[PDB]
Each structure stands twice: as structure tokens, then as C-alpha cells.
From a paper:
The superkiller ([name]) complex is the cytoplasmic co-factor and regulator of the RNA-degrading exosome. In human cells, the [name] complex functions mainly in co-translational surveillance-decay pathways, and its malfunction is linked to a severe congenital disorder, the trichohepatoenteric syndrome. For clarity, we will refer to the human orthologs of the yeast [name] complex subunits as hSKI2 ([name], ∼137.8 kDa), hSKI3 ([name], ∼175.5 kDa) and hSKI8 ([name], ∼33.6 kDa).
Two-dimensional (2D) classifications of the cryo-EM images revealed the presence of two major subsets of particles. We will refer to this reconstruction as the “closed state” of hSKI. The quality of the cryo-EM density map of the closed-state reconstruction enabled us to build most of the atomic model de novo, with two exceptions. Second, the density for the hSKI2arch domain displayed a local resolution of 4–12 Å in focused refinement; therefore, this domain was built by docking a model generated via a structural prediction based on the yeast ortholog (Halbach et al., 2012; Tunyasuvunakool et al., 2021). We will start by describing the closed-state conformation of hSKI, which is generally similar to that observed in the structure of the Saccharomyces cerevisiae ortholog (Halbach et al., 2013). hSKI is scaffolded around its largest subunit, the TPR-containing protein hSKI3. In the closed-state conformation of [name], the basal surface of the hSKI2cat domain binds the hSKI3 solenoid at the first and second superhelical turns and hereby interacts with the adjacent hSKI8OUT and hSKI8IN subunits and with the wedge segment of hSKI2N. The hSKI2arch insertion instead protrudes from the top surface of the hSKI2cat domain, extending into solvent with a curved structure.
Numbering used by the authors:
A (entry chain B): 903 to 1564
B (entry chain A): 1198 to 1246
C (entry chain A): 1 to 50
D (entry chain C), F (entry chain D): 1 to 305
E (entry chain A): 550 to 648
The structure:
């Protein structure tokens, strides 16, 4: 106290020492006052007074605990309550700050009635509006003279939150009347544009934002709103101008992430869809720190141009490494990228898709994406294990995951389109998984329950068709044209979806309508190519080639299927280096005019050049062994035997044993 | 031996900085001590436990 | 819809192998399964929306 | 002036992947000293600290996905574990064979906790409730309800009559088992809680949230006695000493500190792990510490009484 | 001095006066002849096994880099044959092992 | 007749998007003068200086994200390129056939630079390591390690036993290759570095800053013997010439300035490259200058010895 009276410089430290000794009341109030006063002065945050003391001795939490003890001890003094509210506001404990201000309001009614009571009212109302309870905020803002900028602004924002947009516009206009500090005028103009927009009436918003732009110096706030308004519209012409203006003469913005997002969104608007990733790559090159940028690069590569899966995986891992609290999003994006990749790895444990998605699920079990990712991971793992042929695992858990997805979605604020898409996708994947595992009854009941909710939507009915027609066509059976026509009608209902069409063509192939199945595949290929998608195009093309080759296999006449095979394989090789396509060409040549030289050469080069999958190599090896047996050369046969030995094989050598002694 | 004889003084100064009334030396001496002793320099004795 | 039927010999040759095409991921990576059966694509409905 | 702290044993690779929870139980009246640990696998390996070292005893497994919490009981030989697999199958710990299996998904259970008398095995759901099952007697007698968000941590006062539950977004709920009526709700932190623990004699509740601070509340009122801030990242578990004088806290900054509640200060810090430390516990008469970590290791420390 | 110590230990091992405590008077002189002696192997097979078991159980608590640095390896090599040093320029964790 | 610096060439569209790394190797004494560029695509293109111009030889690719740095080796004709996914390729530079594909972890390698005898290929790492991958024979031969932040740019000494490595925080560390013992640490700046270059007969070390300043240092000590304040915006790359007379600097304000050691003043500035310039280089003598900008234009200037 003596040091404070004579105005020294180490009074704050003396109060801190007193706080550390034994919690007396007077020292408690002194320390809280000094912490709040130090926080006010905004020329401090390089001094090593503010930085060390406040941010490295955890002054704020100590002050909060001290004030709680003091306030419960005395509880008839208002400034203590207001100081407690202020500190709680800096800790983002908003509910407790609201309680503190409420008690301060109760204390201060019948003593002063001056500005202090009004300021306490505005603070309580503002904070109450910050966390729900908008009607209470409006009621509190009623009981004050709405004559200063602060109260009017708080009233306006509470009104905007509840609705009543016209009222908010009027309140903001009144606040605009009494304005100094032109920065605030620009902010009020931007708020006007934002609030009136939600009514519609976009043109007045646009012109008003230009009116704000005419001020002496831009504010870095109105420009961002202008760009977002352009994106809410289409034809991003003003948007480009706004972005250029923002970059030109504004450098004091220190986010560096919002600017990248706006630039990427602008490029996405024109449908370019590859530049986006290039631009984000440029931004991450500029500032190789800032994990957020690496994470956003991973997300964009996952969404747009999903052919750089390896780069995306690396970017997500780097984003995760350089910090910890970005764990959630970076792990989610790397898991999805690994899903997209496939299994192009060294068959290493502890780094498959399942492991990373499980890690993310443990980090934040709140968002709805992680659970859908988990379902996709389980299905992909099942298929991969089936290919390796050891054991299918993780059989029956889909229903629980779907329930988790829906329950998590229920608490999400608003991304309406995104939430609808997520729920729909989870439903579709769960039904398909249940159909695959073999639990037809549960899939059927789930679909019926979903359809009972609402009138028909042409997507779910196709799922019900799929569950119905799985038992039959499994065992060979002949179906009547009525059922076939209804299924055709159902697929036609919901078009612009390559899966459905491919599945129906598979149905045709199963019952047997070859040319018709070829037509359905051709329609699917055209749809995929027109969509700008890339996986669907190749998938449809290779599937059609397989269809033609298999139907030819039976040594059928009408030698036209090989021509279709030739055309499809040429297109596939034009796009990429599909090993299956080249093996398919070799098999077609071998089947038609079995012959001696060209077929053997192509097969042997295929089975000798490295960089090929195991199964395709095995198939080519086995057929070449048969052809080599046809055109006798025992040396080469022993060459094949040793080639089998230096690897692991069961069937090629076994056939060789079978046919060495016929 | 020198580091072991230093970590016993950067902890006896924590006892005096609280006594003089210097709450800023305490928050530095309880860091310079916990930041100094981690490994084979301070490995526990064998015939002690 | 023109043929309405196809009659083929289902066990044409017992020496040769039926071809099973399994698709893994959107970036092109196919493999050949041994046992005959359905097309068996992975992630039929596409990537989960992040 | 502090005690003699130091390592006693170091297992090199217990599991093949991260270890997510650990439970130490000196359950039997004789000298058993059983440690049950679960990881990012199906394995629920059951170790035994025999004389100077850990010897693997059981390698039991029945799970499909990684286990997120495991538990042991002090009265009977028993253990329980839950995972992302939507199953709470509880093992036998004597023959290494499964006893039961309860179906419950991430909307019905996240983390386990037995009763003080090993009868009820409460778990925290997704929609806010706490579901209390019945061991050896079936399923789902009753669920206490707090109108909130996802619930992460569940604790029991070791004399009955109190149940605590932290949640995502911070708020804390204290129920009394006698009537099942919410006494009072603390508002606590601003980020998820993911660890809670009462103290022996059940008059001091110690939280550990996601921002780095460790509130020390006080039960039967809402008084808080201080905030312990000495970490540099998330705090993932807190285990309170058998005598009401210390507690151990493990953070995601690769360091397991041991605080004491009398003066709210950190006595000794352990810098021995190389990655996040997901689980710490004491033993019986508390004189040894277990810390299982994200890197596959099981550390056992020496904290003299 | 190298011949002096190998002649002393040669005349000492012929008798049962084996557990000999050499007193040197400076640590460089102390470590010089222990480095230069370099072949005795005064230890049988089972005592080698017991020395290795004890020394690995006590040394395996501490971390990776901390157990592979010059003194630790060199001293373990010396102890395997059955020779030790105990001067003031060694880590305190090795004086206790030697004692 | 005075021979003044002349523009002497322009190549309108070298690549399809921004250009980031340029290397000029007069490796072959015959008329090869191969120049190789990396340009934010998969493509990395090899050009040769035939008589007075650039005639494309081949463009070779395979890279996930944009390429950041390329280097050409003096001893053998061979190239090296690193990308954003930390994945390094070695190019034969006689056929374009990708001799080797040195992999790297999620955080292994950012930029590249060969050893004088074409043996080591030193490279930085996002978390401070300076690990070195021996060329064509070995992988992760050894890693010189320090404690510090991101390491953008790597220098290397011509004679040997020196390796200067800038960091994002703004500090310079020089390590002698003989043993790995940091010679002395230069405090430097408070902003990133982005380029470090030695001299032939390596006695002077030049550091480029992100504040627009350029610093000249003496290797035998920490003598900050210079400070240059001509560039308005950032400085991205600085190179010498085979004699210790003058150097070229490449700002981010679309200007390339040629400074001189003798008087420490800007003798000349060039005005092209509407977009910022990211690379500059000198040929086998002081004659010719190569500049590659953010705009898809290659410029070749002239400056007689």
C-alpha cells in the first residue's frame, strides 16, 4: 500500500507476492485491480512487462481465483463483480461472466443510477446475447437509455441474432448517426450490408459496400465482405477487383489463411478445378510454416483433382507434425487421401487408412465426418483382405456407426447442404455394406423405416430395389420382363449417377443381354466423361472391355466382341498405363488366332517387365506357361519354374507338375 | 559433478527469492532447475533403491 | 433392349481361369481375384464427403 | 527436500501400436499386482509386476478395433474394456477368457468405470446421459441424465454417493447415487475435459481439461481452491494418490509431472517418454507409477511413499 | 611400465593373490595402464555371463543415446575381462557398478 | 567499344505456370551449357544453349506437387530435383531416364545442393535437420542435426568443410563437414533467409534476407563486413561469378540488381519480369546471366567479364 501511494514501479510485484503468501482480502483486490489495469493499456504487448508477467506467470487465472474467493467472502461490492466478469470474458468462460455481471446488476440498482448502472446493463446484455438467450438480451437492452453508440450497437446485434432484420437495420442507422473514429463508420456500413443482405435486396448491399469503399482508407473488413458477397452471387467480376484491391495496398492483415481461401474459392467459381490446387501450392511455398496452409492443401487435393494422393498424404502428415491441435482435421484429410490412394504402399502396418482414421476418431469424437470415414475404411479393409485372401474381418458394425453419424449431425449449427449430403452418403454406404456381408433383413427394415418417414426420393428406392433383387440372381434364375422394366425405370428416375447404371448393366450381364449391357456401360462412360470425373470413365471402360472379352471367351461366332475390346483397350492405354488393360489385350490376342510368335512375345514382355501387380503377373505367367507348353521349349519352361521358385506361387508350378506327366 | 552441485543452488535460491519478496526470481529459479536435470547426469544411484 | 436372351456354354473350358476385376481406390489401381463372382468394387458410392 | 524419484523398469515394446489406456489393480487379497493395458489393436494384454520386472501373463483378445478404455476391479478378479467396435466385452482375468458381451455403440458408451463395490460399471454416452449397466446381472438398469453435449470422463468417489461427469465444451456435472438428482453443475473450462478424478475421502475433485490448466474444485460446494498451470499442451489423464497429498498428471508434451495439492506446485517432472503419454496410474499403497505412452512402451516409476 | 604390470600380474596369477587393488596417483596415469594392458581375460565363462546379466539389467533403464557413449562401452569391455577403474573422471553411475 | 549489358534474349512461354528454380551447368566443355528449370508443375525441363539461344532437348516429369529446387552436378552430367512432397529424383542428363528416385519421409528434404565432387547432395529438413543423402550409392548416409526452426535454404562450400544453412527464424549456422562441430553461430536477422551463397576460393559468405537487406560476412570470423539497402521488397536468390568481383541479386519487386564487392554499390538494375523473379545464375564465366521469374518467361542477360 505504501509503495502504491508514493507511486513506485514494483507495486504490482509486491501485490503478487502478497497473493502468493496467504490470501488476505486487501491484497486480493489490489492484485486484481493491477492485472485489469495492465490489460487495458494496449501499448504494452512487447514490453517484457506484459509478456513475461501476464503471459508467463499465468496472472489472469490467478486473478480469477483470487476474485472468486474475495467476492464470496464480501459480496456487497460491485467493482469486484465487474472485474471478475472482465477476467472471465478474457478466459472465454462466458457463462460465469454472465453470472458475475448479473449479480453486479442486482447490487447497483438503488445507489447511483448513473452511467455505471447503464454500463453494467450493456455489458450484461451483450454477453447474454453472445451465448444464446436472445430474448433476454433484448429485454435487458430495453432497460437503458439508447443514446450512446455502444448500447445501440448491442441492441442491433441482438435483434439481428433473433431475427427482425428491419429493426436491426434501423438500429444500425441510428448508431451510424452518432459516429466518430471513421473506422467505426466503415464497420457499421459493413454491418448494414451484412444484415440487410439476409433479407435479400442484394443490390443495395453492393452499392452500400461501394459507398464504404469510397472512404479515405480501406479497412480490410469491408473488402472481405465484398468478396464474400460476390461469391454469394455468381459471375465473379467485382470479386476479382476486390481481391486485387485487397492485395494492392493492404499488408497489415496478419492472417494469411483467409486470403488464400478467398483466392482459391474465386478460382473454383470459374470451374477451373485444377488451378485451385496450384494456387494453394504457391501459397504454401511462400510461407512454409503455418500448419493451417498445409492442412488446407491436403483438403483441397482430397476434394479437387484427387490424383495427387501421395502428395496429399504427405501434406496432411506434415500439417499434423508441425503442431498438435490441428490433429483433428489433418488426420481426417490424410485418412481420406489414403482411402483414395488404394493400397499403393509396402503393405506396412501402423500406417494404413484404418489406423489413422482411428487415431483421428480418438482425438475428436464430435464431428460427423470421422465416422463416415470409419465406415469407408472398414469396407476398403475388407476388400483388400479378400484380395490378399487371408480373412475378412470387421463384419457387423455398420448400423452402430450410422446411428453415431446421425446423432453427431443433430448438434451441428448450419451447413445444411453438407449435412444432407453426409447423412445421405452414410445411409447409402451402410445399406451397401449390409447387403455385402449378408444381413438382408436388417437392410430391408432400415430402408422401409426410412421410406416411411417421407414421400419417395428416387435414390432410396433404388437401394430398396438392390436389397430386394440380391437373393434372386444370386442363384441362377430367369426373371420376367416386368421386373426388368421396373428396374430400368427406377434407374432412369435418378440419372447422373454412374454407379447405378453400372450395377444395372451388371444385372443384364448376370441374366444375359450382352449388347444391352454394352449400351448401358457406354451410357455410363459418356456420363462419367461429361461430368469431368476421371475414375468413373476408366472404370466403365475397363469393365466394358472385360464384358466383351468374357463373352468372346466361349469361342462364340459373330467376331465383333474383339473389335470392341480393341477399341476400349486403345482408349484406356491412351488415358493411362492400366496393367489390366494390357493383359486384357494379350488375352484377346491369345484367344483369337492363338498363334505362336506375337502372342508369346507380348505375354513374356508383360510377365518380365517390372512394376506390375502380383495377381496380373501370376495370370500372365500361367497362360504363358500353357502357350509355351504348346510350342515346346523345355529350357524356357524350367526358366518359368525357377521364376516361380524365386517368388511364392502355388498354381503355376502345380499345373506344370500336372502337365509334365500328362 | 558441477551440474549436480548447481541444481542444488538453483533450488536453494527459490527459497530465498520467496523470502525477500521477489516473485519474479521465483518463477525463473523454478524453471532453471526443472530445465536442468533430466538424464544420466541425474541418474538415480544403484545401492539407494 | 433387343436380344432379350443369350444362350452360352457356362463351363466352356476347365483349364482356363475366370477373370475377377477388383478396383481399389479412385486413382487407378486394379487387381485380379481368383474365385469367380460379382464385380466387387471397393467404395462403390465414392469417397466420403469431408 | 523432495523424495527420491526414479525409474524401476522399462518395457521395450509391449504392443505393436499406440497404447491408449492402463489400469493397475492389486485386486486380490494376496500379492497379485496385475496390470491390464489396452492399445490400438484388439490386444488387451494382462501383465504382472512380479518382483522387479513385468512378466507377460495373458494376451487375450476378442476385439475388432482399437480399445479406448480398460478397467479392472479391486474386489473380484475381473476386467472390462470398450472400443470403437461397439462392444463392452468384459474378461475373466483368471483363465484369460471372455465372460460376456454387451452391444453398445459410440452413442451408448465411451469410457468405463467400475463401482466401488464392483457391481455397476457406469459409462458415458453420446447424447449426454450416463448409462449404468449391471455386471453379472444383465444390461441397462438406469441412466442419469444431464442436458448437455458429448460426455467423456466418468468417475466415482471411493465411498459411493457421488458420480462426476465431464463433457466436451467444459461443463462438469456431479450426481449423487442416493437419489440420482443433479446437485450442482460447475462450468469449469472452455475445452473438452477428458479426465476427472475424486480424491480418497471424496471431498476434492480434480479435473484436467484440454487447454493445459488443472482446476482443483471442492465437492459439496462449488468452491475451487486454485488452478495448477505447468504444462505446455493438452492434459490427458490424472490419477490421485491414495493419501490426499499428491497426484500425477500426464500431458501431450511428452512429460509426466507429479503435483501436490497442499501448496499447488509441481515437485518432480519425468522427461522419459518420447511421445504423448496416454495413461498414468498408482498402485495400492501408492509408491509406484505406471505410464503407458503413444510410442509403444510401458514405464514404471518409483515414487517413495 | 607395461612390462612391469604384465610381469607383476603374471607372477600374481600363478598364486592365489588375485584380487589386487592398484593405487595410481593421477587419473591420466590411472587410465593409461588400464588402456595399455589390453589382454588378460582373467574371467571364466559363467562369471562372464553373470557380469553381463547384471550389467545389462542395471544399464537398461536409461535411454538409447545415453547408453552408447565412449566411457560406457569402454568400461563394459574392460569389465567383461575382469578389470575396472575407479577414478574421479568417470560418470557416477559407473563407480557404483564397479564397486 | 564499351560492351554494355544487353537483354539479348527473351523466351515468351517456357512453362505453363510459375517458374521456381533455375540451374546452369557448363558441365560439358563442348557446346552443351545445359540449363535446367523447375516450374511448379510435374515438368522439369532441360534446355541447351546452342549458339545464341535456348533449344529444348527434352522435358521430363513425375512429381506430385510443384517442384521447388533443382541442381546440376559438375563432376558427372547428372541433375537432382526435389518437390513439395519431399521426394527427390536424379536425372541422367544424357537421355532423361531417371537413374534413381531417392525417397524421403514426410519431413526429410526441402532444397538441394551437390557436393563439389558430386558425392553428397546436402538437403534441409522442415524440423531443422540437415541430413545428407550420398549420391547414386547410399540413402540417408548421415544427418547433421541442430536445434532450431525451419531451414529454407542451403549453401555449401566449394573447397570443403563448410556448410552454411539459413533458417526461417533468421539465424545462420555454419557447420564444418570435417567432424560436424558447429564452427560459430551467426545471429543474422529477424526474418527468413531464402538464400546463402559462397565464393570460389570460399572466403566470403553472402546472406539474403526477407527484410530487403543483404549481408556480407567473413567466414573466418563473424565479421558483418557489409550491409546493402537497395532492394525495396524481399530478396530471393543471390549468386557470385567465378571471380570475386560482383554478384547478382533477385528481388521480389520485379527487379534484378547487380551489386559489386569492390564498392558495395548497385552498378546496374534490370527492368523486366512483370512478376517477381525467383532465380538467377551465372554461366561458366562472368558473361551471361539467367533469370527465371514468377511469370512464365526466361530471360538471359549479358555482362562481359
Amino acid at each position: 500500500l505504501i509503495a502504491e501511494a508514493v507511486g513506485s514501479y514494483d507495486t504490482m510485484d509486491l501485490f503478487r507476492h502478497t497473493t502468493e503468501l496467504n490470501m488476505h482480502t486487501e491484497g486480493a483486490l489490489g492484485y486484481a485491480y493491477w492485472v485489469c489495469t495492465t490489460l487495458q493499456d494496449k501499448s504494452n504487448r512487447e514490453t517484457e512487462l506484459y509478456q513475461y508477467n501476464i503471459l508467463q506467470m499465468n496472472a489472469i487465472p490467478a486473478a480469477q481465483v483470487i476474485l472468486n474467493k474475495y467476492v464470496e467472502r464480501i459480496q456487497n461490492y460491485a467493482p469486484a463483480f465487474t472485474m471478475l466478469g472482465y477476467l472471465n470474458e478474457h478466459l472465454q468462460l462466458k457463462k460465469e461472466a454472465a453470472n458475475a455481471y448479473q449479480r453486479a446488476i442486482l447490487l447497483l440498482q438503488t445507489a447511483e443510477d448513473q452511467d455505471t448502472y447503464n454500463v453494467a446493463i450493456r455489458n450484461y446484455g451483450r454477453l447474454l446475447c453472445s451465448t444464446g438467450e436472445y430474448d433476454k438480451a433484448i429485454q435487458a437492452f430495453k432497460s437503458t437509455p439508447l443514446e450512446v453508440l455502444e448500447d445501440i450497437i448491442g441492441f442491433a446485434l441482438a435483434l439481428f441474432m433473433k431475427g427482425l432484420y428491419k429493426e436491426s437495420s434501423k438500429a444500425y442507422e441510428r448508431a451510424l448517426s452518432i459516429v466518430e473514429s471513421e473506422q467505426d463508420k466503415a464497420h457499421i456500413l459493413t454491418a448494414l450490408a451484412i444484415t440487410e443482405y439476409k433479407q435479400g435486396k442484394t443490390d443495395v448491399a453492393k452499392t452500400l459496400l461501394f459507398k464504404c469503399s469510397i472512404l479515405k482508407e480501406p479497412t480490410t473488413e469491408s473488402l472481405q465482405a465484398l468478396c464474400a458477397l460476390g461469391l454469394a452471387m455468381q459471375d465473379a467480376t467485382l470479386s476479382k477487383a476486390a481481391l486485387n484491391e485487397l492485395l494492392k495496398h493492404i499488408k497489415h492483415k496478419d492472417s494469411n489463411y483467409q486470403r488464400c481461401l478467398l483466392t482459391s474459392a474465386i478460382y473454383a467459381l470459374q470451374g477451373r478445378s485444377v488451378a485451385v490446387q496450384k494456387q494453394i501450392s504457391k501459397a504454401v511455398h511462400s510461407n512454409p510454416g503455418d500448419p493451417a496452409l498445409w492442412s488446407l492443401l491436403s483438403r483441397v487435393v482430397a476434394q479437387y483433382a484427387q490424383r495427387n494422393a501421395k502428395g496429399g498424404v504427405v501434406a496432411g502428415n506434415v500439417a499434423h507434425i508441425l503442431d498438435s491441435n490441428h490433429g483433428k482435421k489433418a488426420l481426417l484429410y490424410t485418412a481420406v487421401n489414403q482411402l483414395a490412394m488404394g493400397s499403393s504402399s509396402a503393405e506396412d502396418e501402423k500406417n494404413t487408412a484404418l489406423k489413422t482414421i482411428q487415431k483421428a476418431a480418438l482425438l475428436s469424437p464430435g464431428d460427423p465426418a470421422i465416422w463416415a470415414g470409419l465406415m469407408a475404411a472398414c469396407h476398403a479393409d475388407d476388400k483388400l483382405a479378400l484380395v490378399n485372401n487371408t480373412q475378412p474381418k470387421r463384419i457387423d458394425l455398420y448400423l452402430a456407426l450410422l446411428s453415431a453419424v446421425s446423432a453427431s449431425i443433430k448438434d451441428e449449427k448450419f451447413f445444411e447442404n453438407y449435412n444432407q449430403s453426409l447423412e445421405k452418403w452414410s445411409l447409402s454406404q451402410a445399406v451397401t455394406g449390409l447387403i455385402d456381408t449378408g444381413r438382408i433383413s436388417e437392410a430391408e427394415t432400415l430402408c422401409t423405416k426410412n421410406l416411411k418417414s417421407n414421400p419417395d426420393q428416387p435414390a432410396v428406392i433404388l437401394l430398396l430395389r438392390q436389397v430386394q433383387c440380391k437373393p434372386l440372381l444370386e442363384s441362377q434364375k430367369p426373371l420376367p420382363d416386368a421386373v426388368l422394366e421396373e428396374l430400368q425405370k427406377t434407374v432412369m428416375s435418378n440419372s447422373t449417377s454412374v454407379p447405378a447404371w453400372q450395377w444395372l448393366a451388371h444385372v443384364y450381364q448376370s441374366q444375359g443381354m450382352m449388347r444391352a449391357a454394352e449400351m448401358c456401360y457406354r451410357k455410363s462412360l459418356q456420363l462419367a466423361s461429361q461430368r469431368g470425373s476421371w475414375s468413373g470413365k476408366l472404370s466403365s471402360l475397363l469393365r466394358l472391355a472385360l464384358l466383351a472379352l468374357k463373352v468372346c471367351m466361349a469361342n462364340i461366332s459373330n467376331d465383333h466382341w474383339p473389335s470392341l475390346v480393341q477399341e476400349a483397350t486403345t482408349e484406356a492405354l491412351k488415358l493411362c498405363f492400366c496393367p489390366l488393360a494390357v493383359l486384357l489385350q494379350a488375352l484377346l490376342q491369345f484367344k483369337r488366332k492363338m498363334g505362336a510368335r506375337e502372342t508369346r512375345r507380348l505375354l513374356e514382355r508383360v510377365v518380365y517387365q517390372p512394376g506390375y501387380p502380383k495377381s496380373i503377373a501370376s495370370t500372365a505367367r500361367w497362360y504363358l506357361l500353357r502357350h509355351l507348353y504348346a510350342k515346346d521349349d523345355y529350357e524356357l519352361i524350367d526358366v518359368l519354374v525357377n521364376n516361380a521358385k524365386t517368388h511364392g506361387d502355388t498354381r503355376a508350378l502345380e499345373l506344370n507338375q500336372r502337365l509334365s506327366s500328362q | 559433478r558441477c551440474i549436480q552441485r548447481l541444481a542444488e543452488m538453483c533450488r536453494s535460491l527459490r527459497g530465498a527469492a520467496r523470502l525477500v519478496g521477489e516473485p519474479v526470481l521465483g518463477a525463473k529459479m523454478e524453471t532453471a532447475a526443472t530445465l536442468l536435470r533430466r538424464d544420466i547426469v541425474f541418474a538415480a544411484s544403484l545401492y539407494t533403491q | 433392349m433387343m436380344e432379350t436372351e443369350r444362350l452360352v456354354l457356362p463351363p466352356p473350358d476347365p483349364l482356363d481361369l475366370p477373370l475377377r476385376a477388383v478396383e481399389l481406390g479412385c486413382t487407378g489401381h486394379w487387381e485380379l481375384l481368383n474365385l469367380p463372382g460379382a464385380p466387387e468394387s471397393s467404395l462403390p458410392h465414392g469417397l466420403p464427403p469431408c | 527436500m523432495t523424495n527420491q524419484y526414479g525409474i524401476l523398469f522399462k518395457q521395450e515394446q509391449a504392443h505393436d501400436d499406440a497404447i491408449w489406456s492402463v489400469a493397475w489393480g492389486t485386486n486380490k487379497k494376496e500379492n497379485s499386482e496385475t496390470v491390464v493395458t489396452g492399445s490400438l489393436d484388439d490386444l488387451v494384454k494382462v501383465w504382472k509386476w512380479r518382483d522387479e520386472r513385468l512378466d507377460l501373463q495373458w494376451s487375450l483378445e476378442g476385439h475388432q478395433l482399437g480399445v479406448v478404455s480398460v478397467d479392472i476391479s479391486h474386489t473380484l478378479p475381473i476386467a472390462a474394456s470398450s472400443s470403437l467396435d461397439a462392444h463392452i466385452r468384459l474378461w475373466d482375468l483368471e483363465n484369460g477368457k471372455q465372460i460376456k458381451s454387451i452391444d453398445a455403440g459410440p452413442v451408448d458408451a465411451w469410457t468405463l468405470a467400475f463401482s466401488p463395490d464392483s457391481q455397476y460399471l457406469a459409462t458415458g454416452t453420446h447424447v449426454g446421459k450416463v448409462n449404468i449397466f449391471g455386471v453379472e446381472s444383465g444390461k441397462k438398469e438406469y441412466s442419469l441424465d444431464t442436458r448437455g453435449k458429448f460426455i467423456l470422463s466418468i468417475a466415482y468417489s471411493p465411498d459411493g454417493k457421488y458420480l462426476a461427469s465431464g463433457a466436451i465444451d467444459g461443463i462438469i456435472n456431479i450426481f449423487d447415487i442416493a437419489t440420482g438428482k443433479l446437485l450442482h453443475t460447475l462450468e469449469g473450462h472452455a475445452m473438452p475435459i477428458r479426465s476427472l478424478t475424486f480424491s480418497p475421502d471424496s471431498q476434492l475433485l480434480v479435473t484436467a481439461s484440454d487447454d493445459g490448466y488443472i482446476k482443483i474444485y471442492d465437492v459439496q460446494h462449488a468452491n475451487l481452491a486454485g488452478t495448477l498451470s505447468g504444462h505446455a499442451s493438452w492434459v490427458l489423464n490424472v490419477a490421485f494418490c491414495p493419501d490426499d497429498t499428491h497426484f500425477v498428471s500426464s500431458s501431450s508434451d511428452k512429460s509426466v509431472k507429479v503435483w501436490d495439492v497442499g501448496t499447488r506446485t509441481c515437485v518432480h517432472t519425468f522427461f522419459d517418454h518420447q511421445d504423448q503419454v496416454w495413461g498414468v496410474k498408482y498402485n495400492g499403497n501408492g509408491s509406484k507409477i505406471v505410464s503407458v505412452g503413444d510410442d509403444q512402451e510401458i514405464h514404471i516409476y518409483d515414487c517413495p511413499i | 611400465d607395461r612390462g612391469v604390470y604384465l610381469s607383476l600380474l603374471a607372477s600374481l596369477r600363478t598364486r592365489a593373490q588375485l584380487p589386487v587393488v592398484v593405487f595410481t596417483f593421477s587419473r591420466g596415469r590411472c587410465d593409461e595402464q588400464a588402456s595399455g594392458l589390453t589382454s588378460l581375460d582373467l574371467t571364466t565363462s559363467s562369471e562372464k555371463s553373470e557380469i553381463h546379466l547384471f550389467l545389462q539389467r542395471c544399464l537398461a533403464r536409461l535411454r538409447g543415446s545415453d547408453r552408447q557413449l565412449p566411457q560406457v562401452l569402454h568400461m563394459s569391455e574392460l569389465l567383461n575381462r575382469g578389470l575396472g577403474v575407479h577414478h574421479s573422471g568417470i560418470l557416477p553411475i559407473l563407480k557404483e557398478i564397479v564397486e
